[PDB]
RNA sequence: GUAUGUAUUUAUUUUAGAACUAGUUACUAACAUUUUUUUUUUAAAAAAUAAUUAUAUAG
RNA sequence: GAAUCUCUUUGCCUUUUGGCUUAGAUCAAGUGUAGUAUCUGUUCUGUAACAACUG
């Protein structure tokens, strides 16, 4: 949707750093992104 | 055959439309710098006129909630009219003269404007950070002609002078579908059939082609009329079995959508041609045609 | 996505014979690679063999006359097993000559490669078709259709696009004429300094070198007729 | 990837049909980076071997 | 004898192949993703008459 070259900030560990320490949060994000790079619709339906 | 006529506009009518669901009152923006409402019942006179722009009026649309509608004109400007009180909510001034405007079904605040410098401006009523301009589109090469939003509210269509058709998602600025052929011609009018499995376009080679509204958009042919000069509207029955078009020779043509057979061919008083042809969805078998003659004809 | 056919010698079917005939009619005898590209599973040399040995109408496939048959026994006696020379002496294909010689002197497994496949009879086809043969005839009709170059096809496209561009350019003028603002038509621009506009002047006007007779009243009658036509096109519009 | 071509007007000149559905072919696209030598039986048996790659292509 | 309309052979050919050389030369076995093309299958088929006014 962007109409202008810009820097946008996100926090990719959503709220995990309260209850979950950071290293398991990175490996969780590894599992999710490997799923979305592997099958891309089965995993997107698994979240949804 | 025609029943009754309205004292429409000196020097011609350039756009007229109905209310989309109920249709109890119609409007036309005219060549003599005026936009007027009429009732389709109980009086047959003019409920509410208003002076609009300084130049003649090019196009009109509707927000689907119908409290307000759109206006676009040859003075390089677009305005939004409250159809009840009559006051203006936004006035907007452009670079080039605007060819066509359209409003979103889901929200009244999104609308798209397509200019004659091959750009589609996508403004917004609510946000006022950059004069409402959310996004502009620039994949067309030449001055675009007509643009018609989907009834579903997600994607929309545009046509242009450079003999191609593009389909966009709502604010992506990437055409997901390019309908382009070698022997194609440009179409000054688009419309979507009420069954929503097809949208059809009135092409410049005096025909009407029809494409899918489902994915893998692909191309029946409605012929028997001469409309190469001017660029003429087309409407559909409120059941979805009839398509009706105008002509350069002051007669309208009604085809059966189910078989593409020309059923009837009714002429209209006035030497001048007829462009805007609109159907009443509630009351069946009722059309209204009008053109450069200026009067507003209610055909059966 | 087709796996590669490295050895393309097969059995000539009906489809490939007919595509070879309708390819030789258009492409001609001496371009063989362009013929054999049209029909897959065969080679340019095997297309040449299938023409020069079997599909050619000049070739002589009849029964042998008695003088012909005695000529064959005598020539096969004089020239020991030189069958191209003998078949040249008889104006008949050499395979016909060899098989008829075997018939005179008389009185294939599966999984073998047949070398003589171009000289042998065709195989008629099953009733519907195979899928690859549908694809073959589709691309063969598509390649036998086209007779144009790149420049000429682009010229077709450019003429259609300039035509529709003129139509849009007149459409906007007619709309502004209805509005009451008369935009005159702009002219195309000159690509060089002495490029000629053809409404300004009669460009290389040659007068008809007058004779003995008198042409004043006929001049006046023509001038009247042309002025009246221009006025009628101005008012009513042709 | 070049060559080469095409598009970019404002300072106003007097008045037979309807619906549902998915893969097979071609062609195109400066757009994108899962080892070696065997043996043997009819999956199991043997033997073996060694601090890590280019932004470079045009008629 | 002669004109009008209409059909056969006979003439006419009237959209009726516009250079050269070493046939000018070479070769048509790549994966994904994407665009374009086409191709199979299934189901369903208000009008008339009478009484009154002519504004």
XYZ file of C-alpha atoms (C1' of nucleotides) in Angstrom:
700
model
C 0.000 0.000 0.000
C 3.029 2.288 0.264
C 3.200 5.406 -1.901
C 6.511 6.788 -0.659
C 9.927 5.280 0.143
C 9.911 4.849 3.872
C 11.171 3.075 6.978
C 8.445 1.246 8.929
C 9.025 -0.422 12.305
C 7.613 -3.762 13.407
C 8.215 -6.004 16.402
C 8.333 -9.497 14.981
C 8.159 -11.169 18.367
C 4.547 -9.997 18.834
C 4.261 -9.974 22.668
C 6.376 -13.035 23.275
C 9.171 -11.420 25.272
C 7.017 -11.137 28.386
C 6.161 -14.806 28.868
C 8.717 -16.368 26.504
C 12.431 -15.686 26.433
C 13.986 -14.430 23.229
C 15.912 -17.468 22.003
C 12.918 -19.796 21.933
C 11.054 -16.919 20.294
C 13.614 -16.830 17.479
C 13.360 -20.578 16.981
C 9.553 -20.296 16.980
C 9.844 -17.664 14.259
C 12.195 -20.024 12.414
C 9.525 -22.756 12.459
C 6.828 -20.371 11.238
C 8.858 -18.892 8.400
C 10.104 -22.305 7.249
C 6.483 -23.419 7.113
C 5.416 -20.349 5.134
C 8.353 -20.847 2.775
C 7.680 -24.560 2.426
C 3.957 -24.956 1.858
C 2.693 -21.354 2.161
C -1.027 -22.133 2.255
C -1.305 -25.169 4.500
C 0.598 -23.251 7.178
C -1.379 -20.057 6.527
C -4.518 -22.117 7.123
C -2.939 -23.720 10.225
C -2.615 -20.262 11.789
C -6.132 -19.358 10.660
C -42.178 2.575 -27.116
C -41.526 5.912 -25.369
C -44.196 7.266 -23.009
C -43.268 10.648 -21.517
C -40.386 13.108 -21.687
C -38.744 15.544 -19.276
C -37.629 19.125 -20.056
C -34.107 17.972 -19.403
C -31.341 20.379 -20.422
C -30.576 22.948 -23.089
C -27.656 21.856 -25.318
C -27.846 18.211 -24.227
C -27.601 15.843 -21.269
C -24.161 14.397 -20.621
C -25.017 11.975 -17.773
C -28.088 10.641 -16.012
C -28.412 7.878 -13.427
C -30.971 6.314 -11.108
C -30.945 5.486 -7.437
C -29.338 2.043 -7.302
C -31.709 0.047 -5.115
C -35.012 1.910 -4.979
C -34.894 4.169 -8.022
C -37.683 6.466 -6.880
C -35.771 9.549 -8.066
C -33.327 10.088 -10.939
C -30.725 12.762 -11.701
C -28.935 14.245 -14.699
C -25.962 16.531 -15.000
C -26.367 18.630 -18.108
C -24.382 20.568 -20.668
C -25.743 23.896 -19.371
C -23.740 23.950 -16.113
C -26.573 22.492 -14.002
C -27.226 19.302 -12.052
C -30.877 18.495 -11.441
C -32.828 15.764 -9.657
C -36.258 14.539 -10.762
C -38.742 12.160 -9.194
C -39.580 9.033 -11.166
C -43.047 9.080 -9.579
C -45.969 11.170 -8.245
C -45.157 14.506 -9.957
C -42.726 13.989 -12.896
C -41.133 17.390 -12.203
C -37.875 18.781 -10.813
C -37.634 18.386 -7.041
C -34.218 19.980 -6.592
C -31.859 21.683 -9.003
C -28.464 23.110 -8.145
C -25.806 25.013 -10.032
C -22.658 22.955 -10.050
C -19.444 23.809 -11.808
C -18.378 26.498 -14.264
C -17.770 24.262 -17.310
C -20.066 21.461 -18.574
C -20.436 18.279 -16.544
C -18.624 15.098 -17.607
C -19.784 12.351 -15.232
C -21.776 11.460 -12.116
C -21.816 8.503 -9.714
C -23.248 7.398 -6.381
C -22.017 6.584 -2.987
C -24.036 3.441 -2.341
C -25.419 4.784 0.938
C -26.846 7.539 -1.332
C -26.736 10.481 1.088
C -24.090 11.988 -1.196
C -22.907 11.636 -4.765
C -20.109 12.748 -7.041
C -19.616 15.330 -9.771
C -16.768 15.815 -12.250
C -16.404 18.528 -14.858
C -14.401 20.180 -17.633
C -13.164 22.910 -15.263
C -10.596 20.347 -14.005
C -12.586 19.894 -10.787
C -14.519 17.319 -8.749
C -17.139 18.014 -6.057
C -19.208 15.952 -3.614
C -22.882 16.854 -3.206
C -25.220 16.094 -0.328
C -28.301 14.961 -2.225
C -30.725 15.927 0.540
C -29.726 19.381 1.768
C -27.696 20.361 -1.282
C -24.478 21.471 0.365
C -20.941 20.474 -0.577
C -18.617 18.336 1.530
C -15.445 18.427 -0.583
C -14.288 20.438 -3.574
C -11.151 19.238 -5.365
C -9.094 20.739 -8.167
C -6.990 18.676 -10.522
C -4.210 19.057 -13.046
C -5.865 17.641 -16.175
C -9.535 17.427 -17.031
C -11.147 14.436 -15.301
C -12.706 11.807 -17.523
C -14.524 9.575 -15.036
C -15.103 9.169 -11.310
C -16.283 6.221 -9.184
C -17.208 5.583 -5.558
C -16.666 2.511 -3.423
C -19.630 0.325 -2.380
C -18.370 -0.644 1.073
C -17.291 2.772 2.348
C -18.684 6.093 1.102
C -15.359 7.783 1.767
C -13.135 5.930 -0.687
C -13.434 7.106 -4.276
C -11.315 6.941 -7.414
C -10.817 9.610 -10.080
C -9.329 8.961 -13.520
C -7.814 11.834 -15.458
C -6.799 12.394 -19.048
C -3.088 12.267 -18.214
C -3.101 8.440 -17.772
C -3.445 8.539 -13.982
C -6.013 7.180 -11.535
C -6.095 9.214 -8.331
C -7.467 7.392 -5.288
C -8.560 9.999 -2.771
C -10.274 9.569 0.596
C -12.818 11.751 2.380
C -11.716 10.947 5.928
C -7.924 11.395 5.951
C -6.694 14.914 5.156
C -2.907 14.574 5.389
C -2.032 15.082 1.704
C -5.336 16.537 0.396
C -6.889 13.108 0.889
C -4.723 11.501 -1.804
C -4.128 7.959 -0.601
C -2.550 6.650 -3.806
C -2.176 7.267 -7.535
C -2.031 4.674 -10.334
C 0.106 4.994 -13.442
C 0.217 1.753 -15.435
C -1.885 3.178 -18.259
C -0.079 5.010 -21.048
C -2.807 7.302 -22.393
C -5.895 9.242 -21.361
C -8.249 6.822 -19.661
C -11.923 6.655 -20.527
C -14.100 4.873 -17.977
C -13.633 2.962 -14.736
C -16.154 0.751 -12.947
C -15.818 -0.639 -9.440
C -16.817 -4.166 -8.494
C -20.021 -4.705 -6.521
C -18.017 -6.928 -4.189
C -15.869 -4.012 -3.073
C -12.340 -5.327 -3.530
C -11.180 -4.911 -7.132
C -12.022 -2.601 -10.021
C -11.595 -2.072 -13.743
C -10.342 0.756 -15.959
C -10.221 1.296 -19.716
C -8.053 3.707 -21.653
C -7.228 5.282 -25.005
C -4.208 2.991 -25.503
C -6.528 -0.017 -26.285
C -6.018 -2.044 -23.107
C -8.040 -2.896 -19.991
C -6.531 -3.273 -16.526
C -7.878 -4.700 -13.284
C -6.563 -3.540 -9.906
C -6.993 -4.608 -6.361
C -8.126 -1.802 -4.135
C -4.910 0.063 -3.317
C -2.048 -2.093 -4.608
C -1.027 -0.039 -7.708
C -0.273 -3.322 -9.492
C -2.543 -4.467 -12.348
C -3.378 -8.096 -11.626
C -5.009 -8.497 -15.040
C -4.216 -6.913 -18.402
C -6.867 -7.544 -21.064
C -5.031 -6.640 -24.266
C -5.334 -8.056 -27.772
C -3.968 -7.201 -31.190
C -7.269 -6.528 -32.970
C -8.921 -4.977 -29.914
C -10.335 -1.445 -29.744
C -10.751 0.860 -26.769
C -14.017 0.910 -24.840
C -15.462 4.168 -23.469
C -17.878 2.368 -21.146
C -17.704 -0.573 -18.740
C -20.496 -2.194 -16.746
C -20.993 -5.281 -14.575
C -23.943 -7.620 -15.087
C -26.145 -8.229 -12.011
C -25.451 -11.982 -11.997
C -21.810 -10.939 -11.290
C -20.267 -13.743 -13.378
C -19.597 -11.312 -16.229
C -18.816 -7.679 -16.890
C -19.154 -6.303 -20.402
C -17.605 -3.405 -22.283
C -18.868 -1.323 -25.183
C -16.010 -1.410 -27.670
C -15.195 1.068 -30.418
C -15.801 -1.391 -33.281
C -19.596 -1.137 -32.782
C -19.822 -4.311 -30.699
C -20.088 -5.322 -27.042
C -17.627 -7.878 -25.657
C -18.050 -9.580 -22.289
C -15.484 -10.982 -19.851
C -15.584 -13.041 -16.664
C -15.672 -11.504 -13.209
C -14.083 -14.654 -11.797
C -10.335 -15.246 -11.840
C -8.491 -16.012 -15.078
C -10.472 -13.178 -16.668
C -11.304 -14.219 -20.209
C -13.754 -13.478 -23.013
C -21.109 -12.804 -25.975
C -20.750 -10.371 -28.855
C -23.623 -7.887 -29.099
C -23.805 -6.315 -32.546
C -26.290 -4.473 -34.722
C -25.732 -0.842 -33.708
C -23.427 1.963 -34.865
C -21.760 3.698 -31.920
C -18.251 4.411 -33.204
C -18.398 8.181 -32.946
C -19.392 9.175 -29.454
C -19.134 6.649 -26.638
C -22.423 5.391 -25.281
C -23.658 3.901 -22.016
C -25.276 0.490 -21.599
C -27.609 -0.852 -18.918
C -29.068 -4.186 -17.835
C -32.417 -5.507 -16.673
C -32.996 -5.818 -12.949
C -33.446 -9.551 -13.478
C -30.352 -9.894 -15.638
C -31.692 -11.182 -18.957
C -31.735 -7.961 -21.006
C -28.987 -5.552 -22.060
C -29.882 -2.161 -23.550
C -27.636 0.233 -25.477
C -27.962 3.509 -27.327
C -26.767 4.591 -30.756
C -25.555 7.523 -32.842
C -28.834 7.465 -34.797
C -31.231 8.194 -31.877
C -32.560 4.645 -31.349
C -31.935 2.165 -28.558
C -31.192 -1.538 -28.963
C -32.236 -4.268 -26.543
C -30.578 -7.687 -26.669
C -31.413 -10.809 -24.705
C -28.409 -11.608 -22.490
C -29.142 -15.327 -22.519
C -28.713 -15.876 -26.275
C -27.395 -12.545 -27.736
C -30.373 -11.909 -30.005
C -31.484 -8.372 -30.852
C -35.071 -8.264 -29.640
C -36.276 -4.746 -30.378
C -35.100 -1.438 -31.761
C -37.023 1.661 -30.688
C -36.391 5.131 -32.092
C -36.612 8.347 -30.084
C -37.611 11.934 -30.960
C -34.725 14.321 -31.456
C -32.309 14.324 -34.368
C -29.293 14.264 -32.065
C -27.760 10.959 -30.872
C -28.289 9.177 -27.552
C -25.540 8.109 -25.145
C -26.754 7.578 -21.564
C -29.182 4.667 -21.227
C -30.270 3.630 -17.739
C -32.650 0.964 -16.418
C -34.965 0.911 -13.386
C -34.193 -2.186 -11.261
C -37.468 -2.226 -9.321
C -40.066 -1.539 -12.032
C -39.358 -4.022 -14.811
C -39.446 -3.203 -18.545
C -38.632 0.474 -18.035
C -35.666 2.275 -19.604
C -34.675 5.950 -19.858
C -32.561 7.226 -22.763
C -31.217 10.719 -23.449
C -28.529 12.409 -25.484
C -27.368 15.553 -27.261
C -30.951 16.625 -27.978
C -31.493 17.503 -24.333
C -34.855 16.022 -23.384
C -35.122 12.958 -21.154
C -37.145 10.138 -22.688
C -38.854 7.390 -20.696
C -38.962 4.357 -22.967
C -40.955 1.183 -22.367
C 8.649 -31.339 -20.133
C 8.786 -33.756 -23.047
C 11.667 -36.136 -22.445
C 14.174 -35.954 -25.312
C 13.759 -38.171 -28.353
C 17.350 -38.727 -29.408
C 16.689 -41.322 -32.125
C 13.773 -40.253 -34.304
C 13.404 -43.096 -36.771
C 9.898 -44.476 -36.447
C 6.998 -45.912 -38.372
C 5.365 -43.428 -40.753
C 1.700 -43.057 -39.840
C -1.056 -41.360 -41.820
C -0.844 -38.069 -39.901
C 2.829 -37.532 -40.623
C 2.451 -38.372 -44.321
C -0.364 -35.867 -44.705
C 1.469 -33.134 -42.804
C 4.540 -33.825 -44.947
C 2.446 -33.426 -48.105
C 0.786 -30.191 -46.986
C 4.203 -28.973 -45.859
C 5.887 -29.745 -49.179
C 3.135 -27.841 -51.012
C 4.018 -24.666 -49.111
C 7.671 -24.997 -48.192
C 8.961 -26.699 -51.298
C 11.226 -29.621 -51.951
C 14.668 -28.325 -51.062
C 13.933 -27.030 -47.538
C 13.770 -30.261 -45.571
C 14.685 -29.141 -42.072
C 11.819 -26.662 -42.162
C 9.480 -29.477 -43.244
C 10.671 -31.922 -40.596
C 10.424 -29.310 -37.859
C 6.691 -29.212 -38.536
C 6.217 -32.890 -37.676
C 7.978 -34.189 -34.590
C 9.350 -37.753 -34.147
C 11.032 -37.679 -37.618
C 14.276 -36.314 -39.058
C 15.101 -34.017 -42.008
C 16.819 -36.886 -43.787
C 13.910 -39.225 -43.084
C 11.530 -36.617 -44.454
C 13.718 -36.560 -47.565
C 13.589 -40.354 -47.803
C 9.824 -40.427 -47.283
C 9.362 -37.985 -50.132
C 11.860 -39.341 -52.658
C 10.990 -42.972 -51.972
C 7.263 -43.144 -51.309
C 5.123 -39.968 -51.247
C 6.274 -38.582 -54.593
C 3.599 -38.736 -57.335
C 6.210 -39.039 -60.089
C 7.178 -42.463 -58.748
C 5.987 -45.572 -60.558
C 3.938 -47.927 -58.377
C 2.198 -50.268 -60.812
C 2.425 -53.923 -61.724
C 5.313 -54.892 -63.939
C 4.672 -55.570 -67.595
C 6.166 -58.665 -69.189
C 8.865 -56.716 -71.029
C 9.552 -54.860 -67.763
C 9.873 -58.122 -65.860
C 12.208 -59.752 -68.387
C 14.191 -56.498 -68.419
C 14.519 -56.855 -64.655
C 15.871 -60.403 -64.855
C 18.348 -59.399 -67.551
C 19.556 -56.233 -65.781
C 19.909 -58.094 -62.492
C 22.023 -60.574 -64.415
C 24.291 -57.952 -66.010
C 24.808 -55.608 -63.046
C 25.354 -57.746 -59.921
C 23.256 -56.336 -57.040
C 23.630 -52.683 -57.992
C 20.037 -51.792 -57.264
C 20.190 -48.000 -57.452
C 21.590 -48.195 -60.998
C 18.945 -50.766 -61.984
C 16.131 -48.738 -60.415
C 17.438 -45.696 -62.257
C 17.265 -47.737 -65.461
C 13.639 -48.598 -64.781
C 12.300 -45.259 -63.447
C 10.921 -47.189 -60.460
C 11.788 -46.974 -56.751
C 14.489 -49.433 -55.726
C 12.479 -51.119 -52.991
C 9.758 -52.057 -55.495
C 12.482 -53.438 -57.739
C 14.049 -55.545 -54.963
C 10.731 -56.997 -53.775
C 9.621 -57.826 -57.312
C 12.993 -59.469 -57.965
C 12.414 -61.625 -54.883
C 8.976 -62.551 -56.232
C 10.575 -63.563 -59.536
C 13.329 -65.706 -58.061
C 10.955 -67.334 -55.579
C 8.916 -68.900 -58.398
C 10.937 -58.741 -38.776
C 10.584 -59.434 -35.084
C 9.350 -57.102 -32.388
C 11.821 -54.819 -30.694
C 13.778 -54.387 -33.930
C 14.578 -51.139 -35.690
C 13.190 -51.151 -39.217
C 15.601 -49.370 -41.579
C 13.176 -49.489 -44.516
C 10.362 -47.612 -42.807
C 10.257 -44.719 -45.267
C 9.679 -47.017 -48.214
C 6.914 -49.032 -46.601
C 3.147 -48.593 -46.392
C 1.517 -46.205 -43.932
C -0.507 -47.128 -40.880
C -4.079 -45.789 -40.693
C -5.126 -44.454 -37.373
C -7.439 -45.278 -34.504
C -10.759 -43.553 -34.644
C -10.521 -40.539 -32.369
C -6.795 -39.517 -32.319
C -3.907 -39.552 -29.835
C -3.324 -36.354 -27.830
C 0.126 -35.598 -29.264
C -1.307 -35.890 -32.765
C -3.994 -33.322 -31.909
C -1.165 -31.049 -30.737
C 0.832 -31.790 -33.896
C -2.010 -30.843 -36.254
C -2.772 -27.730 -34.206
C 0.780 -26.415 -34.429
C 0.978 -27.530 -38.061
C -2.080 -25.487 -39.025
C -0.601 -22.610 -37.025
C 2.684 -22.770 -38.928
C 1.090 -23.294 -42.336
C -1.116 -20.258 -41.795
C 1.382 -17.424 -41.490
C 2.730 -15.536 -44.494
C 4.146 -12.295 -43.028
C 7.341 -10.889 -41.543
C 7.898 -9.004 -38.325
C 7.769 -5.602 -40.035
C 4.510 -6.333 -41.857
C 2.742 -7.695 -38.773
C 3.791 -4.602 -36.837
C 2.399 -2.535 -39.719
C -1.004 -4.224 -39.342
C -0.940 -3.409 -35.623
C 0.142 0.210 -36.149
C -2.544 0.887 -38.743
C -5.261 -0.417 -36.407
C -3.938 1.629 -33.493
C -3.673 4.864 -35.500
C -7.234 4.255 -36.715
C -8.665 3.978 -33.199
C -6.546 6.948 -32.099
C -8.161 9.109 -34.806
C -11.607 7.952 -33.691
C -10.947 9.050 -30.093
C -9.532 12.357 -31.357
C -12.778 13.065 -33.222
C -14.902 11.906 -30.274
C -13.503 14.570 -27.944
C -14.016 17.264 -30.595
C -17.660 16.289 -31.073
C -18.197 16.423 -27.302
C -16.664 19.902 -27.115
C -18.750 20.951 -30.122
C -21.853 19.929 -28.186
C -20.519 21.945 -25.249
C -19.981 24.942 -27.529
C -16.166 25.158 -27.664
C -14.791 24.432 -31.131
C -11.310 22.915 -30.889
C -9.905 22.830 -34.408
C -8.118 19.692 -35.522
C -4.366 19.774 -34.975
C -2.249 18.540 -37.853
C 0.502 15.909 -37.740
C 3.973 17.331 -37.398
C 6.586 17.375 -40.132
C 9.526 15.011 -39.803
C 11.746 17.257 -41.937
C 11.874 20.840 -43.050
C 10.237 20.576 -46.460
C 7.613 17.970 -45.659
C 4.508 18.704 -47.672
C 1.009 19.453 -46.399
C -1.567 18.448 -48.983
C -4.453 20.813 -48.324
C -2.527 24.056 -48.724
C -1.799 23.748 -52.436
C -2.331 21.511 -55.386
C 1.148 20.222 -54.958
C 2.489 19.713 -58.478
C -0.385 21.267 -60.406
C -0.221 20.615 -64.125
C -2.537 22.672 -66.300
C -4.137 20.770 -69.194
C -2.570 22.957 -72.014
C -5.613 24.574 -73.686
C -6.690 23.871 -77.237
C -8.986 25.429 -79.782
C -12.303 25.033 -77.982
C -13.745 27.293 -75.306
C -14.226 26.350 -71.649
C -15.579 29.386 -69.781
C -19.146 28.279 -69.073
C -18.073 24.751 -68.126
C -15.555 26.256 -65.711
C -18.362 28.316 -64.170
C -20.648 25.269 -63.957
C -17.979 23.180 -62.177
C -17.166 26.040 -59.799
C -20.860 26.368 -58.938
C -21.191 22.617 -58.322
C -18.095 22.372 -56.094
C -19.021 25.448 -54.045
C -22.512 24.045 -53.500
C -21.101 20.659 -52.416
C -18.759 22.285 -49.876
C -21.652 24.326 -48.444
C -23.823 21.215 -48.173
C -21.101 19.293 -46.321
C -20.695 22.298 -44.011
C -24.401 22.517 -43.147
C -25.743 18.961 -43.335
C -22.582 16.858 -43.175
C -22.253 14.546 -46.212
C 21.337 -5.990 -22.380
C 21.832 -2.522 -26.381
C 20.290 -0.152 -31.301
C 15.935 2.459 -32.794
C 11.168 4.585 -32.507
C 6.870 6.262 -30.169
C 3.873 9.371 -25.875
C 4.067 14.311 -22.838
C -0.714 22.374 -24.843
C -0.545 26.666 -22.077
C -0.093 32.244 -23.258
C -8.586 32.062 -25.268
C -8.069 35.186 -33.006
C -13.841 38.687 -33.200
C -19.749 35.204 -35.700
C -29.334 -23.804 -29.032
C -28.390 -21.203 -24.519
C -27.708 -21.152 -18.789
C -24.460 -22.763 -14.699
C -19.852 -26.007 -12.170
C -14.791 -27.696 -12.561
C -9.584 -28.807 -12.871
C -4.876 -30.194 -15.575
C -1.922 -30.581 -20.769
C 0.462 -28.533 -24.539
C 3.533 -24.865 -27.118
C 6.020 -19.913 -27.047
C 8.245 -15.644 -24.293
C 10.770 -13.539 -19.811
C 18.633 -9.311 -17.990
C 13.637 -13.005 -13.299
C 15.260 -16.554 -9.703
C 22.464 -20.213 -7.143
C 20.482 -32.462 -2.585
C 28.491 -35.690 -3.872
C 32.734 -39.581 -6.188
C 34.628 -45.488 -6.703
C 31.896 -49.993 -6.278
C 30.749 -55.011 -4.602
C 26.676 -58.983 -2.612
C 21.787 -60.967 -1.968
C 16.466 -60.753 -2.880
C 15.032 -53.980 2.369
C 19.555 -55.941 4.407
C 25.645 -57.247 3.818
C 30.534 -55.134 2.647
C 34.359 -51.641 0.860
C 35.625 -46.317 0.295
C 36.893 -41.048 0.525
C 37.981 -35.781 0.821
C 37.494 -24.551 7.223
C 33.566 -23.559 2.479
C 31.946 -20.301 -6.258
C 30.937 -15.651 -10.326
C 27.916 -9.003 -10.815
C 31.262 -10.912 -14.869
C 27.569 -12.090 -21.710
C 25.352 -8.440 -27.296
C 23.897 -8.021 -33.534
C -35.802 -6.590 -87.680
C -35.429 -4.333 -82.889
C -35.119 -3.007 -77.387
C -35.626 -4.707 -71.485
C -34.475 -8.704 -67.828
C -31.724 -13.592 -67.127
C -28.396 -18.185 -68.107
C -24.300 -21.063 -71.025
C -19.735 -21.942 -73.744
C -16.029 -17.973 -76.307
C -12.618 -13.515 -75.466
C -10.797 -10.548 -71.192
C -7.835 -12.233 -65.638
C -9.260 -7.874 -63.893
C -6.612 -8.324 -55.054
C -4.162 -13.322 -60.319
C 4.221 -14.922 -56.395
C 8.534 -7.412 -57.211
C 16.728 -8.581 -56.424
C 21.755 -10.825 -54.938
C 25.627 -14.661 -52.333
C 28.767 -19.585 -49.329
C 20.513 -23.879 -51.044
C 23.147 -16.481 -47.140
C 24.449 -19.475 -42.587
C 23.715 -22.239 -38.312
C 20.393 -25.409 -34.961
C 15.919 -26.826 -32.690
C 18.277 -31.904 -24.953
C 17.834 -26.494 -19.799
C 14.480 -26.444 -13.612
C 11.129 -23.242 -10.911
C 7.716 -19.321 -10.905
C 4.783 -16.146 -13.939
C 2.090 -14.212 -18.386
C -0.456 -15.407 -23.095
C -2.821 -19.095 -26.199
C -6.348 -23.547 -26.672
C -8.962 -28.214 -24.984
C -11.901 -31.463 -22.591
C -15.486 -32.989 -18.988
C -20.540 -32.424 -16.015
C -25.644 -30.629 -15.019
C -30.603 -27.643 -16.321
C -34.192 -25.910 -20.007
C -54.330 -6.821 -19.238
C -58.122 -7.148 -23.482
C -63.144 -6.498 -25.519
C -68.301 -4.771 -25.296
C -72.176 -1.576 -23.324
C -74.050 3.334 -20.439
C -71.748 9.081 -20.245
C -68.842 13.502 -21.830
C -66.011 15.961 -26.260
C -62.170 19.349 -23.603
